[PDB]
Design an enzyme around this catalytic site. Structure first.
Site, short mmCIF file in Angstrom:
data_model
loop_
_atom_site.label_atom_id
_atom_site.label_comp_id
_atom_site.label_asym_id
_atom_site.label_seq_id
_atom_site.Cartn_x
_atom_site.Cartn_y
_atom_site.Cartn_z
N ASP A 1 5.85 38.96 -11.53
CA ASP A 1 5.60 37.62 -11.73
C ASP A 1 4.13 37.48 -10.80
O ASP A 1 4.09 38.39 -9.80
CB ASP A 1 6.63 36.50 -11.55
CG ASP A 1 7.34 36.59 -10.16
OD1 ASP A 1 6.55 36.60 -9.12
OD2 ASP A 1 8.25 36.50 -10.07
N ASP B 1 7.66 22.25 -14.73
CA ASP B 1 8.04 23.35 -13.55
C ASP B 1 7.24 24.31 -13.39
O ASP B 1 7.84 25.30 -13.26
CB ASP B 1 9.33 23.27 -13.59
CG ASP B 1 9.86 23.80 -12.18
OD1 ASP B 1 9.12 23.63 -10.95
OD2 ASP B 1 10.89 24.42 -12.18
N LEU C 1 8.47 40.98 -19.18
CA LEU C 1 7.18 41.30 -18.44
C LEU C 1 7.83 41.83 -16.95
O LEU C 1 8.50 41.31 -16.36
CB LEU C 1 6.21 40.15 -18.23
CG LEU C 1 5.46 39.80 -19.79
CD1 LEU C 1 6.35 38.84 -20.39
CD2 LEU C 1 4.07 39.60 -19.06
N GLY D 1 16.20 37.49 -11.39
CA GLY D 1 16.01 36.25 -10.56
C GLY D 1 16.52 35.11 -11.04
O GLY D 1 17.00 34.82 -12.31
N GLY E 1 16.39 31.17 -11.97
CA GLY E 1 15.40 30.03 -12.42
C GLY E 1 15.99 28.94 -12.39
O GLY E 1 17.06 28.41 -12.12
N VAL F 1 20.25 31.88 -14.19
CA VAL F 1 20.28 33.28 -13.75
C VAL F 1 19.53 33.91 -14.97
O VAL F 1 19.97 34.03 -16.02
CB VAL F 1 21.33 33.98 -13.30
CG1 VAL F 1 22.36 34.08 -14.53
CG2 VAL F 1 20.98 35.48 -12.71
N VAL F 2 18.65 35.17 -14.46
CA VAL F 2 18.03 35.92 -15.48
C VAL F 2 18.18 37.16 -15.07
O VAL F 2 17.89 37.91 -13.85
CB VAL F 2 16.35 35.63 -15.53
CG1 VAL F 2 15.60 36.21 -16.67
CG2 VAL F 2 16.18 34.35 -15.29
#
Length: 283
Positions: A79, A120, A76, A11, A13, A17-18
């Site tokens: 979310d 945030d 992990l 996703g 962030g 980007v992750v």
């Protein structure tokens, strides 16, 4: 990549980007964030490698190579945003909401004790695992990095243009998340800064100098703001019990100085009966 294998995109962030990736040396699976482009930021983010807690997503490494910046985090699998979407028909069971809120307050209390804010918090940066743990990702990044991103969890002092932050901004965001877990709807889903502010005012009442001394001198305060009356929490987060509504009230005070601390919130009667249930997580 030279040191990692790219498993899949997890996703976008705030600061970039992750990807899910595998460390070539070790075989471990990690979340790799590529920072969208500063010597300041590198030492300050590197300090965060020491900030370890069971309810914080562990910053494994800061990689500055080829003039690019990557943050390596423990991985992990889900979310809270996805978990709430997956849970929308029945809702998250109350004992698990309570467990999640309790653990998030422990993570905040830890970071706040080390003078680190998030600024945030949102469901997308709250990560869960099969063991019943929830962990906060991205503490400390906003201070270190500075400047369609969601407004929904933004404390009113930020929306009113206060150029300084306190721990209270994170309590506010967590209170909004608490409400959304309970009702299965975002508390304040603004689609612009003024819509965000006016959704808050329509629920909590337009703030004034009685409930928030100093508010009328904040940078973006306008005397022309409409004056709405404040709704009862009983209307806002049914069917949460009076313990839950009392705690939520304390997390959503207008004056950041009146808002409950993470530490004090852990002692609230709402958590008398807290437990650590097993979530049903389909991966």
């Amino acid at each position: 990549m030279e040191n990692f294998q790219k498993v899949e995109k997890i996703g976008e962030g705030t600061y970039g980007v992750v990807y899910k990736a595998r460390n070539k040396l070790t075989g471990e699976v990690v979340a790799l964030k590529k920072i969208r482009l500063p010597s300041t930021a590198i030492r300050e983010i590197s300090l965060l490698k020491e900030l370890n807690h069971p309810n914080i997503v562990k910053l494994l490494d800061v990689i500055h190579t080829e003039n690019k910046l990557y943050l390596v985090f423990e991985f992990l699998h889900q979310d809270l945003k996805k978990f709430m979407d997956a849970s929308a028909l029945t809702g998250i069971p109350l004992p698990l909401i309570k467990s999640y809120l309790f653990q998030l307050l422990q993570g905040l209390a830890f970071c706040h004790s080390h003078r680190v804010l998030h600024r945030d918090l949102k469901p997308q940066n709250l990560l869960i695992n099969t063991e019943g743990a929830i962990k906060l990702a991205d503490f400390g990044l906003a201070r270190a990095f500075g400047v369609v991103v969601t407004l929904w969890y933004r404390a009113p002092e930020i929306l009113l243009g206060c150029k300084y932050y306190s721990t209270a901004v994170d309590i506010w965001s967590l209170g909004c998340i608490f409400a959304e877990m309970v009702t299965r709807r975002a508390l304040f889903p603004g689609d612009s800064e003024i819509d965000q502010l006016f959704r808050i005012f329509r629920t909590l009442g337009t703030p004034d100098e009685v409930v928030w001394p100093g508010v009328t001198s904040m940078p973006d305060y306008k005397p022309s703001f409409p004056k709405w009356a404040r709704q009862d929490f009983s209307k806002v987060v049914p069917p949460l019990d009076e313990d839950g509504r009392s705690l939520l009230s304390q997390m959503l005070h207008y004056d950041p100085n009146k808002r409950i601390s993470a530490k004090a919130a852990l002692a609230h009667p709402f958590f008398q009966d807290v437990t650590k249930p097993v979530p049903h997580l389909r991966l």
